[PDB]
Design a binder for this molecule. Structure first.
Ligand SMILES: Cc1cccc(-c2ccc(-c3cc4cnc(NCCCN5CCOCC5)nc4n(CCCCN)c3=O)c(Cl)c2)n1
Length: 267
């Protein structure tokens, strides 16, 4: 992190665009390029126990160089405040884009395909995302789909072995992807009506969720593949990129601008 430069001279801070982990997130302008950025400001006086978690996510982001992972531009310390500068993605999150109404299976398949490309990248780099969910999938204004908000190394997207504090690996991300597929299809993850502490024992106790409703059998099978209780029975991200649901239904990401437009016109 840069300790000399004054982030308030380098960036113009604009409106809040999100409640982030450990701090609020603002739309900002890079004053030298006039590009829009996302700025997370964390008060390190008021968030002291979590500082190592913040450092860990910065480290992981700084090691990533993929079209499918939100870019990290650096961080600055001013008085007690840490400014973290990231790529601004103007389409908003996939969770945002569920608000006007249901996605169609081409949109679901396209978003899942792009998430899978990001997971393929991370897993090939021996990284685990750890918090795959629609709120952490961001779209550019062109429809590009990228991962953000890595989990630290709410239970609804957690694999059973993560909850049982077993040794887990990248297959935990594949379970979370299955939950995210249900969320993209239905609007909410399984058990969304229940208190989190009940969900904490239901996920290990119960059979895995299934996708309920009038969805194509390939989509239900995609979900069932990801949501195996046994991690070794879950496919890899590489394998899932060849799943018939993806191959039959995914299309150009640029088509997702229609989804972004529907969210803009809805508001
Ligand atoms: C602790 C730690 C360590 C290292 C890094 C970070 C860290 C994590 C995430 C981000 C972040 C980036 C980001 C980019 N673009 C966007 N666009 C939203 C546009 C919405 N508009 C609404 C109006 O209509 C148009 C669309 N939002 C971003 N958000 C907010 C959303 C988070 C979703 N989970 C970020 O939180 C940053 Cl900067 C740093 N954290």
């Amino acid at each position: 992190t840069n300790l000399k430069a004054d982030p308030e001279e380098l960036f113009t801070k604009l409106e809040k665009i999100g409640k982030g982990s450990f701090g609020e997130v603002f739309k900002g302008i890079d004053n030298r390029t006039q590009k829009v950025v996302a700025i997370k400001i964390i008060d390190l006086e008021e968030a002291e126990d979590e500082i190592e978690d913040i450092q860990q996510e910065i480290t992981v982001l700084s090691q990533c160089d993929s079209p499918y992972v939100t870019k990290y531009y650096g961080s600055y310390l001013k008085d007690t405040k840490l400014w973290i500068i990231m790529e601004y993605l103007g389409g908003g999150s996939a969770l945002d884009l569920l608000e006007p109404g249901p996605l169609d299976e081409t949109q679901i398949a396209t978003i899942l395909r792009e998430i899978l490309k990001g997971l393929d990248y991370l897993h090939s780099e021996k990284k685990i995302h750890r918090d795959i969910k629609a709120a952490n999938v961001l779209l550019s204004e062109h429809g590009e789909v990228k991962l953000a908000d890595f989990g630290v190394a709410t239970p609804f997207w957690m694999a059973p072995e993560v909850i049982k504090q077993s040794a887990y690996d990248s297959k935990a991300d594949i379970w979370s992807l299955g939950i995210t597929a249900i969320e993209l299809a239905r609007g909410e993850p399984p058990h969304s009506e229940l208190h989190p502490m009940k969900v904490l024992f239901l996920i290990p106790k119960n059979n895995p969720p299934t996708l309920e409703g009038n969805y194509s059998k390939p989509l239900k099978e995609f979900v069932e593949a990801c949501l195996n209780k046994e991690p070794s029975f879950r496919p890899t991200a590489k394998e899932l990129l060849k799943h018939k649901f993806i191959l039959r239904n995914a299309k150009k990401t640029s088509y997702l601008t229609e989804l972004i437009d529907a969210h803009h016109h809805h508001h």
